[PDB]
Amino acid sequence: QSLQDPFLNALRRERVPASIYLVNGIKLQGQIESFDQFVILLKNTVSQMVYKHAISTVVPSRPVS
Amino acid sequence: SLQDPFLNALRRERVPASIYLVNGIKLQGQIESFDQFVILLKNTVSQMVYKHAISTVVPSRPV
Amino acid sequence: LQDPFLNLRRERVPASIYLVNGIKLQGQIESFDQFVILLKNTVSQMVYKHAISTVVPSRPV
Amino acid sequence: QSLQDPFLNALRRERVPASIYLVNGIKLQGQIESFDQFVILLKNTVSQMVYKHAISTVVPSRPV
Amino acid sequence: SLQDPFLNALRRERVPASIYLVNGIKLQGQIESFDQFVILLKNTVSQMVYKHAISTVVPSRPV
Amino acid sequence: SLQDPFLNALRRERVPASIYLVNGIKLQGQIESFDQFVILLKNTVSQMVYKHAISTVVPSRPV
RNA sequence: AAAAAAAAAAAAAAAAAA
């Protein structure tokens, strides 16, 4: 089955800073606030909506259980 | 399940937004409407933006 | 929706179709279906919608 | 109603030259020889297979 | 049914092939195998290429 | 399929792998795990690489 | 461009046979 939900849920739960590298190289830094089938909400100065199809990677700022 | 409430909030409040496309271009306007595949943005005219080409939607201020 | 928007075709407004690579294509929306839109300028060319980022009217429609 | 098969089949039937602009700007010129739901076959000396998902615009060298 | 006949023809005749990715990168090797979403190309090693990132599959010579 | 067993070869033999993204960036680490949409690449941290942004994945050595 | 471990982001190069 799926493993994307637990990976993002581990970061959202533990409040660990995360880097979302987009398909064009731009690195979004913030906190996973929520996510659904198609988007993730990244939080910093404001809460923005990132489309999953335009993400290449999601890197945790530190190892996560 | 949560994309609509996000965009919808931007429509209720009439808050300026900044849509970043997959190629880094930053479009700015007002979310007037949207459907499963596109978001209608406004400024001078009403332009139709395909969601498959949007990389990010940033509200100009917290809502 | 995208159909009532594209249906630009009626008012014969000139339109720009920005591609995902930044290229601007100016013509007129001649026709469309589920996947493509045909734009007219010198010939009727076929523009795939998956390569489209923005459809801007030259003026309020 | 499909607006795609007739457009390509007309370029095939009239053996009219074409230019396939890819999503990265590369312009491939050749002849539409065949196509299915996912690919077009462009022809010069060697027939190559082009994926539709990488195509941005298919344009005819002349009105068809 | 147009992809399968094409790739299999290069896989059967062992024809050197160029796989142009969507970002312009040109891979050169041989079509060892393929499935609905990937093509396994070969040279010093058998690398897996996703179809969604390929733009063209060109034979080194007519086939 | 042609990618479920392919990734598993790198997941079982612990061979360092290289993942090239659609934008040319080369990732490097070890296939920790994978599913229909993602691959976890390991090094300092275990990052989640989306398949749709993957063009190629080459084993660093013949497998 | 056999490939920039990655430009908090070019309101946008009618288009680099790559």
Author numbering:
A (entry chain A): 5 to 69
B (entry chain B), E (entry chain E), F (entry chain C): 6 to 68
C (entry chain D): 7 to 13, 15 to 68
D (entry chain F): 5 to 68
Quote the authors verbatim.
The RNA chaperone Hfq plays crucial roles in bacterial gene expression and is a major facilitator of small regulatory RNA (sRNA) action. Hfq is a member of the Sm/LSm superfamily of RNA-binding proteins, which is found in almost every organism from all three domains of life. The conserved core of the Hfq monomer consists of an α–β1–5 fold, and when these pack into a hexamer, three faces are presented for interaction with RNA.
To further elaborate on the properties of V22A Hfq mutant, we obtained diffracting co-crystals of the V22A mutant using two poly(A) RNAs, pA4 and A17. The crystals of V22A/pA4 diffract to roughly 3.0 Å, and the crystals of V22A/A17 diffract to 2.1 Å. For the V22A/A17 crystal, a hexamer occupies the asymmetric unit with 49% solvent content, and the lattice interactions are like those observed for the V22A/pA4 crystal, including the gap between proximal face stacks.
